[PDB]
Amino acid sequence: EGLKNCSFNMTTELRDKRQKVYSLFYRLDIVPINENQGSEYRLIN
Amino acid sequence: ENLWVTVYYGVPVWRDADTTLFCASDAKAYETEKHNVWATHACVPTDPNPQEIHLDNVTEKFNMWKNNMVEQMHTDIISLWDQSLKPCVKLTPLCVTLHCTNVTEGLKNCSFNMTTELRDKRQKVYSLFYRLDIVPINENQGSEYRLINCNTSACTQACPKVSFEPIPIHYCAPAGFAILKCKDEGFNGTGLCKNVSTVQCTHGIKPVVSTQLLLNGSLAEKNITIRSENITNNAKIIIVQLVQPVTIKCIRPNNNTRKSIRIGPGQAFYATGDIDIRQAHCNVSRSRWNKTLQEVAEKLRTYFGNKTIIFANSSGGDLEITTHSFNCGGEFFYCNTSGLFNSTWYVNSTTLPCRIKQIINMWQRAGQCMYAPPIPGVIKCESNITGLLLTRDGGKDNNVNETFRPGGGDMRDNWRSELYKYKVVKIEPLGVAPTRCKRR
Amino acid sequence: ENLWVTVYYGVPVWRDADTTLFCASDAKAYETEKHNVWATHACVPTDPNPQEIHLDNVTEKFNMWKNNMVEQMHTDIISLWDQSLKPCVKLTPLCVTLHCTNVTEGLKNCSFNMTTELRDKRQKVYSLFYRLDIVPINENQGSEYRLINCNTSACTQACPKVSFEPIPIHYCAPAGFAILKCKDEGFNGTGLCKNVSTVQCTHGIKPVVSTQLLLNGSLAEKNITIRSENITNNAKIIIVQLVQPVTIKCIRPNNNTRKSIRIGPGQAFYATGDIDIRQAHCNVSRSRWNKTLQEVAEKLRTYFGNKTIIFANSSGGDLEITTHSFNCGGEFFYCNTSGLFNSTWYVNSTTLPCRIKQIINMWQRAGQCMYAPPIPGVIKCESNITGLLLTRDGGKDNNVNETFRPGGGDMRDNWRSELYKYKVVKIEPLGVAPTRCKRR
Amino acid sequence: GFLGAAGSTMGAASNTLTVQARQLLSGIKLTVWGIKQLQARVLAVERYLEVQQLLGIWGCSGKLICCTNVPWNSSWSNKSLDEIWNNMTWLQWDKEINNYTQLIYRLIEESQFQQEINEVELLALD
Amino acid sequence: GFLGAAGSTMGAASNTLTVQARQLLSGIKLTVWGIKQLQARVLAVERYLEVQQLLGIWGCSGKLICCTNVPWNSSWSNKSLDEIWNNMTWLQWDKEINNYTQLIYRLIEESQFQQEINEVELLALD
Amino acid sequence: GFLGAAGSTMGAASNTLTVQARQLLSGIKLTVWGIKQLQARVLAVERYLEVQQLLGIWGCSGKLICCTNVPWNSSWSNKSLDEIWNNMTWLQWDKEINNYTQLIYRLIEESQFQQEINEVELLALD
Ligand SMILES: *[C@@H]1O[C@H](CO)[C@@H](O[C@@H]2O[C@H](CO)[C@@H](O[C@@H]3O[C@H](CO[C@H]4O[C@H](CO)[C@@H](O)[C@H](O)[C@@H]4O)[C@@H](O)[C@H](O)[C@@H]3O)[C@H](O)[C@H]2NC(C)=O)[C@H](O)[C@H]1NC(C)=O
Ligand SMILES: *[C@@H]1O[C@H](CO)[C@@H](O[C@@H]2O[C@H](CO)[C@@H](O[C@@H]3O[C@H](CO[C@H]4O[C@H](CO)[C@@H](O)[C@H](O)[C@@H]4O)[C@@H](O)[C@H](O)[C@@H]3O)[C@H](O)[C@H]2NC(C)=O)[C@H](O)[C@H]1NC(C)=O
Ligand SMILES: *[C@@H]1O[C@H](CO)[C@@H](O[C@@H]2O[C@H](CO)[C@@H](O[C@@H]3O[C@H](CO)[C@@H](O)[C@H](O)[C@@H]3O)[C@H](O)[C@H]2NC(C)=O)[C@H](O)[C@H]1NC(C)=O
Ligand SMILES: *[C@@H]1O[C@H](CO)[C@@H](O[C@@H]2O[C@H](CO)[C@@H](O[C@@H]3O[C@H](CO)[C@@H](O)[C@H](O)[C@@H]3O)[C@H](O)[C@H]2NC(C)=O)[C@H](O)[C@H]1NC(C)=O
Ligand SMILES: *[C@@H]1O[C@H](CO)[C@@H](O[C@@H]2O[C@H](CO)[C@@H](O[C@@H]3O[C@H](CO)[C@@H](O)[C@H](O)[C@@H]3O)[C@H](O)[C@H]2NC(C)=O)[C@H](O)[C@H]1NC(C)=O
Ligand SMILES: *[C@@H]1O[C@H](CO)[C@@H](O[C@@H]2O[C@H](CO)[C@@H](O[C@@H]3O[C@H](CO)[C@@H](O)[C@H](O)[C@@H]3O)[C@H](O)[C@H]2NC(C)=O)[C@H](O)[C@H]1NC(C)=O
Ligand SMILES: *[C@@H]1O[C@H](CO)[C@@H](O[C@@H]2O[C@H](CO)[C@@H](O[C@@H]3O[C@H](CO)[C@@H](O)[C@H](O)[C@@H]3O)[C@H](O)[C@H]2NC(C)=O)[C@H](O)[C@H]1NC(C)=O
Ligand SMILES: *[C@@H]1O[C@H](CO)[C@@H](O[C@@H]2O[C@H](CO)[C@@H](O[C@@H]3O[C@H](CO)[C@@H](O)[C@H](O)[C@@H]3O)[C@H](O)[C@H]2NC(C)=O)[C@H](O)[C@H]1NC(C)=O
Ligand SMILES: *[C@@H]1O[C@H](CO)[C@@H](O[C@@H]2O[C@H](CO)[C@@H](O[C@@H]3O[C@H](CO)[C@@H](O)[C@H](O)[C@@H]3O)[C@H](O)[C@H]2NC(C)=O)[C@H](O)[C@H]1NC(C)=O
Ligand SMILES: *[C@@H]1O[C@H](CO)[C@@H](O[C@@H]2O[C@H](CO)[C@@H](O[C@@H]3O[C@H](CO)[C@@H](O)[C@H](O)[C@@H]3O)[C@H](O)[C@H]2NC(C)=O)[C@H](O)[C@H]1NC(C)=O
Ligand SMILES: *[C@@H]1O[C@H](CO)[C@@H](O[C@@H]2O[C@H](CO)[C@@H](O[C@@H]3O[C@H](CO)[C@@H](O)[C@H](O)[C@@H]3O)[C@H](O)[C@H]2NC(C)=O)[C@H](O)[C@H]1NC(C)=O
Ligand SMILES: *[C@@H]1O[C@H](CO)[C@@H](O[C@@H]2O[C@H](CO)[C@@H](O[C@@H]3O[C@H](CO)[C@@H](O)[C@H](O)[C@@H]3O)[C@H](O)[C@H]2NC(C)=O)[C@H](O)[C@H]1NC(C)=O
Ligand SMILES: *[C@@H]1O[C@H](CO)[C@@H](O[C@@H]2O[C@H](CO)[C@@H](O[C@@H]3O[C@H](CO)[C@@H](O)[C@H](O)[C@@H]3O)[C@H](O)[C@H]2NC(C)=O)[C@H](O)[C@H]1NC(C)=O
Ligand SMILES: *[C@@H]1O[C@H](CO)[C@@H](O[C@@H]2O[C@H](CO)[C@@H](O)[C@H](O)[C@H]2NC(C)=O)[C@H](O)[C@H]1NC(C)=O
Ligand SMILES: *[C@@H]1O[C@H](CO)[C@@H](O)[C@H](O)[C@H]1NC(C)=O
Ligand SMILES: *[C@@H]1O[C@H](CO)[C@@H](O)[C@H](O)[C@H]1NC(C)=O
Ligand SMILES: *[C@@H]1O[C@H](CO)[C@@H](O)[C@H](O)[C@H]1NC(C)=O
Ligand SMILES: *[C@@H]1O[C@H](CO)[C@@H](O)[C@H](O)[C@H]1NC(C)=O
Ligand SMILES: *[C@@H]1O[C@H](CO)[C@@H](O)[C@H](O)[C@H]1NC(C)=O
């Protein structure tokens, strides 16, 4: 346990398309953005 | 009679070196912040007089192939490109949805959205592109193109104030090192040169941007000249330098112009404003070339016996290599060299169309694309072809038809062009000899 | 009586030098990361003691004008700014739609949309600006302004931990180069100085940025001092240094503070948080200045003969230049110098309001704007005025009324202010002489 | 002894020498002052090394007050040794002598320090 | 006097010396040329210095045509001084002697410059 | 011959000198390790040129085992030459002697290498 399965929006090689992209994270990569919500984490830096 | 060890200091003894080398030229303005890619006067203008001297009887074995300068220049000039482009814009605000249209062939007419000087407002903006600037985004659709780099590489545009115009650089050796010069034209870069000299700094060597045909480098005498690492390796490069020049005056026949668009607040991109629209062209008349090549063939026959010989097109490989290619002003050409190398050379009693490109992958690097500034001008080249990167056919196909294609197999060899005459050496002042003496 | 060549080694012979020079100071903490633009211990603290010695009898021609050092320091300081700003933020997202409101005059109250620490979420964020930070985007509309740079240039905010506070620097000459110091105040920068010394490194120059009035520079003695390349060039600079000090204590009378916003994750922008609001001002009581200028005029008449003289305002040119301007702490001032230069000086029996700004175009460069940090403080300047960059009028008014305006004519000349006393030279240890000898 | 001191007459000036010699050599990521110091030390080192090379080919790096029997060419200033060592002064001397110096700075490297073992040949070889 | 000239035979070549010696030392933010100039000068400085260091421990930095009583070893070459100065030639001579040079470049630092005060011990101390 | 070897008693230690002298001078885009190399070489070179500069004003950069008649001042250690060469040792010797050395590193630069041609005045001039 503690290996979160995640996805986010980002630019591609084009500075237009919000490509939906997928990555794993060990839990200590992240913190909640403001509140205990499934869409709401940021990278710990 | 008896003898002792003794030393003379500073007598002439020398060997090859991995030694570093540094620039000189005339000063163009003495502004440290000058408009220049090769030498913004941060290259010190070490004496513009070549103070060269005779090496009478000094039999020096040369070696154009184990020479250090090719690798050094290749590294140095790549360093210069980066050090000219780091000050100017990277084009992360440019890989984007491009919409394009077809107009009088393959100078595609186009528009896109981008950030303006403000990181909020989209600006719709307009430019020309030559078709080889772009690829389709995913599918055959009018809205769906991207710049040819974006697939794997980021682009960067030099200020039009970073001219690629080939100002010569003179390589100085540092002190305790020197250049030996083969003081003959009747010479090839391996084994002895019987007539020689030395200089602290090479006579002018053109950076010679060149890709297939040696432009701008000087001529020989006595005979047309051939140079190779090993002529029996049909795959590895063959260099020619002519006894006679031929001049080429290529043109963008299209009245095309700088459109400055702000792309972030300190960042200025040069879009491409239009004027009929025609393909880039090069006036050279055939027969001077034809009968010059007839002697190139005759020089080459000295290695091979009495073949009928052919020069034939480069083909199939990447267009960045497989067309002849060079700058004029600040904008680059990629010409269908076939029209000048589709030709036959018997023994018995014996002009190009071109594509422009706004993007180049110079030195075949990953990353670090240059979007060359489209020039404010009907660009005109005014320049000499003087030599050939030949490749002889790998298919050995003997005793009938042995033949060549032009190539660009290493831009190191686009510098070997002139470098062949220079050997870079350490001087060791360590003159042990027998004599006899007693201390004073 | 015969003679031979002889040599004495290290004998004092010297000449003007186009040589490099390098920094020293006291150590402020020994910490490489000690918060500073000038000399954060990257400048080596070479001996803080000025180990100077008398050039007794050593007659020398000084040259304040063909001096290398002005251009060297000018190039240097600009490099210090760059290699203090590269360590902190480029504000590449900040040129954006600014909305503003008017509040008790020209301290505009404003808010804008920007990236947060996440490259997706807009954040509404808030800051003060002085009006001279902004220009209208296209039209007289409440939402429609951009930062004054964005029109041609990109901005960079320096960490408040890059304090522009003028810690002195000592230029050392490197060994075999040396500094000659004109050892009198009764001197102007061209021709002989009769009394002299030598220093390995100069007394701290004081690189206060200074725009028109010499802040922080040392006093003269015997008389007020006047310096110029050529006084018959009315257009080119006149420097004054005073025999008496003067002192100014300018203030932001407004309780104004750091607001820190992440514009990208590594990128803390310093917005400006507010507290009644009053224009920035200064206190220098008139009569001290007045009778000082009465003597400045007399020293000027010692060139010109018996004219009535006026000091009049700088006008029409760029506000960056035409105000007197300086840093206090880390925030920048632009004072309407008119109230201190609107004054008259007969022969016979004879306080500033100010604008603050956050953007500066320092050294009048294209690109490379600095957005100065809004200092958290009711900021207080505490400093000496000690000299004047005057200009004399192009009114060659035929021996009647000839007159002056202060100016920011060159920031090199804002350094000439102190460099005048120091002449940098090469020692050549090559004492050829007649005498007699034979080898041992 | 002091540094500088050119206004001491040239002989009395030579009561100081070696301390000025020390002053020829030491003062007695990129970062902007760092690269400037590095350039500065190299220029000083090479310039100091340029005068050691002079003190090679002129001789006398082994003896920092120097002898050769090379001609004092009477085309130069005829000023007396008495004037020079006891009334004249180094800057004011070089500023009279510079016009000749480039001749001396070559003619000084005559055989005594440029060729003389070619003459020790007569002293030591049959 | 020319630079180079090794095809002049070794004695005739030694009509010139010190001009080749000047060439050992001078040619007679940044872009790549700025850092490469700085690297270049240091490599030359070090090299110039390395040979002065040889002319320390070999002696003769003060007398740039050198003397010692070190053996000429008959295993190197029996070629005559007559041949050497008047017919043989420096590059071609080093292309004979290099096979021994590393032996000599140590064996030359015998006592005459490596140790000799240990022998002056008998000359000047009881 | 070894490097270091300071526990060899000072005379026997001087069976080695020049191999240590070589160790003084040679080890026997910009980038981090490249700027470190450049800085390192300059610091070693400039430090190496300081001791050669000492061996200017001390003399003896030619004869690398040095003579002067400068006084051994009896305020320094009275240790016998016999102890020094044959029982006592270099690090230990400097750790005894350094408290005197700032006198010696100036009092050494007496007339022999600071003023002696001012005495050649009486030898060669009237
Ligand atoms: C080597 O290749 C080079 C190009 O790669 C050739 O150099 C120059 O290339 C440019 C761009 O293609 C040409 O176009 C322009 O030429 C004008 C010329 O101005 C000068 O001449 C006029 C009189 O003719 C004079 O009034 C002016 O004051 C100048 O002295 C320039 O103003 C433009 O900036 C731009 O350079 C050049 O014509 C072309 N030649 C030269 C010498 O500039 C080069 O010719 C090739 N060399 C060889 C040996 O093949
Ligand atoms: C030359 O111009 C300079 C500005 O360009 C003047 O330098 C300093 O400028 C700042 C900002 O305007 C002033 O304000 C603050 O001063 C305090 C001083 O703290 C020290 O003194 C108190 C006792 O008074 C003591 O309790 C403290 O422990 C400190 O020892 C600083 O802490 C602030 O950071 C900030 O600097 C300075 O007052 C002002 N002077 C100095 C010496 O910092 C400078 O005054 C001008 N000099 C001349 C000769 O004209
Ligand atoms: C990538 O970006 C798109 C938007 O361009 C995201 O779509 C949005 O997803 C949310 C749920 O996560 C949708 O629900 C609404 O959210 C708001 C804000 O909390 C709430 O107030 C509403 O009640 C509602 O639940 C929303 O409709 C949807 N579309 C838009 C235009 O916002 C998408 O989720 C992102 N995907 C990734 C993997 O980042
Ligand atoms: C293909 O090239 C054409 C021609 O350059 C671009 O079309 C339009 O060009 C005109 C300038 O000639 C732009 O402004 C208009 O000019 C006419 C006079 O020529 C004037 O009567 C109008 O009031 C207006 O000012 C026009 O904006 C431009 N069209 C676009 C789409 O911007 C065209 O931009 C190029 N194709 C692409 C895909 O950009
Ligand atoms: C600049 O940006 C605007 C939007 O701010 C672009 O407008 C968009 O144009 C397309 C046609 O090219 C409109 O049609 C729709 O396109 C999608 C994707 O191809 C397709 O699936 C739909 O069936 C439909 O045809 C679209 O509604 C329109 N607006 C938006 C919000 O996408 C404009 O094309 C851009 N222009 C340039 C030159 O970049
Ligand atoms: C002109 O170029 C030639 C090479 O293209 C230079 O010298 C020649 O170099 C080749 C390769 O090292 C030698 O060829 C080999 O010779 C051996 C022995 O005969 C043979 O068994 C191999 O099959 C191969 O052919 C060749 O002998 C050598 N010498 C000559 C005189 O050609 C030559 O130095 C250059 N000359 C000038 C004037 O520039
Ligand atoms: C390259 O080598 C090829 C093959 O040797 C040359 O191709 C031939 O060139 C001739 C003209 O020199 C062409 O003749 C023309 O054909 C048209 C169409 O029938 C006719 O209207 C003209 O009156 C004329 O006869 C011929 O078609 C062509 N043949 C082939 C197989 O390509 C070519 O000239 C060489 N040069 C270049 C630049 O390609
Ligand atoms: C494209 O062809 C033009 C001729 O039409 C080449 O010359 C340039 O022509 C323009 C007008 O199209 C000239 O502008 C005018 O100049 C006069 C005098 O300076 C001024 O009174 C007018 O108000 C207007 O500005 C222009 O001077 C002329 N030269 C240049 C260097 O642009 C032009 O060379 C061709 N285009 C390119 C990109 O080479
Ligand atoms: C012009 O300046 C005013 C005053 O600083 C800015 O308006 C609003 O100021 C208050 C702080 O006084 C901000 O917070 C609010 O404070 C009150 C108590 O004063 C409290 O009751 C509220 O719950 C709230 O915390 C308020 O956020 C701020 N408004 C905005 C738009 O941020 C105003 O921002 C300035 N004008 C512009 C165009 O920015
Ligand atoms: C931050 O961004 C929001 C949108 O995310 C901005 O909201 C926009 O505000 C304007 C009024 O200022 C709204 O009215 C419309 O404006 C246009 C252009 O001026 C005008 O043509 C229309 O008639 C209408 O007045 C607009 O609907 C609204 N939303 C959008 C999507 O534009 C907000 O103004 C920004 N605030 C700051 C402090 O930057
Ligand atoms: C104080 O400053 C003056 C210059 O302001 C320094 O010397 C003076 O330099 C000027 C320009 O080189 C000389 O003026 C010219 O003299 C000729 C001949 O009489 C005349 O035809 C020209 O119209 C022009 O006036 C001037 O003679 C010269 N001398 C003096 C005594 O001023 C001076 O070295 C500085 N002195 C001090 C004590 O700081
Ligand atoms: C603006 O005027 C104030 C006086 O009101 C100047 O001093 C600062 O005043 C604030 C409150 O207005 C002080 O904050 C309070 O301090 C106490 C004691 O340390 C603490 O227990 C409270 O929780 C509260 O934080 C503050 O300490 C004081 N000093 C500073 C440097 O802010 C102030 O100097 C004027 N503004 C500026 C930016 O100079
Ligand atoms: C700088 O130069 C001055 C001379 O311009 C030195 O002052 C004195 O110079 C004379 C030169 O003849 C020294 O000799 C003395 O001469 C007078 C007659 O002129 C004689 O009566 C004395 O008995 C003695 O022979 C004199 O000692 C010297 N006096 C001093 C020490 O001031 C001055 O010394 C030089 N300053 C420096 C470079 O320190
Ligand atoms: C180059 O070497 C040639 C021999 O290669 C020198 O030529 C002649 O050598 C003879 C030997 O008997 C000398 O007497 C001649 O004096 C030399 N030639 C002349 C006329 O000088 C030749 O001088 C050397 N080249 C140089 C260095 O000039
Ligand atoms: C080709 O360009 C014309 C205008 O010249 C345009 O009408 C047409 O839609 C374009 N077709 C394609 C497939 O690009
Ligand atoms: C290039 O070479 C091929 C043969 O490999 C030939 O068919 C073709 O016509 C040539 N020219 C061009 C422009 O492709
Ligand atoms: C000026 O600011 C006040 C608030 O202080 C606001 O009510 C008014 O609308 C503003 N007027 C203009 C023209 O900006
Ligand atoms: C500045 O100079 C002009 C004359 O050029 C004058 O009218 C004006 O009143 C002066 N002062 C200010 C504050 O502009
Ligand atoms: C050190 O001194 C001892 C005496 O006990 C001796 O045996 C040894 O070899 C010496 N080592 C050296 C030469 O450093």
Numbering used by the authors:
A (entry chain A): 151 to 152, 154 to 185, 185A, 186 to 195
B (entry chain E), C (entry chain I): 32 to 134, 138, 151 to 152, 154 to 185, 185A, 186 to 321, 325 to 355, 357 to 400, ...
D (entry chain J), E (entry chain F), F (entry chain B): 521 to 548, 567 to 664
List sentences quoted exactly from the publication behind this structure:
Recognition of N-linked glycan at residue N276 (glycan276) at the periphery of the CD4-binding site (CD4bs) on the HIV-envelope trimer is a formidable challenge for many CD4bs-directed antibodies. The glycan at residue N276 (glycan276), in particular, has been found to restrict antibody access to the CD4bs, an important site of vulnerability targeted by many broadly neutralizing antibodies isolated from chronically HIV-infected patients. Cryo-electron microscopy (cryo-EM) structures of these two antibodies and 179NC75, a previously identified glycan276-dependent CD4bs antibody, in complex with HIV-envelope trimer reveal substantially different modes of glycan276 recognition. Despite these differences, binding of glycan276-dependent antibodies maintains a glycan276 conformation similar to that observed in the absence of glycan276-binding antibodies.
Antibody 179NC75 was isolated from HIV-infected donor EB179, and in a humanized mouse model, HIV-1 YU2 virus escapes 179NC75 neutralization through a N276 mutation. We succeeded in determining a 4.8-Å resolution cryo-EM structure of the 179NC75 Fab in complex with a stabilized Env trimer of clade A strain Q23.17. 179NC75 bound to an epitope that overlapped the CD4bs and interacted with glycan276 at the outer edge of its epitope. The 179NC75 epitope was smaller than those of VRC40.01 and VRC33.01, with most of its binding interactions occurring within the outer domain of the CD4bs. The 179NC75 heavy chain dominated interactions with the trimer, with its CDR H3 contributing ~75% of the paratope-surface area and interacting with loop D, β23-V5-β24, and CD4-binding loop. The light-chain CDR L1 contributed ~20% of the paratope, with CDR L2 and FR L3 having minor interactions. The relative positions of the heavy and light chains were rotated ~90° from those of VRC40.01. Consequently, glycan276 interactions were contributed solely by heavy-chain CDRs H1 and H3. Overall, the 179NC75-Env trimer complex structure presents yet another mode of recognition for glycan276-dependent antibodies.
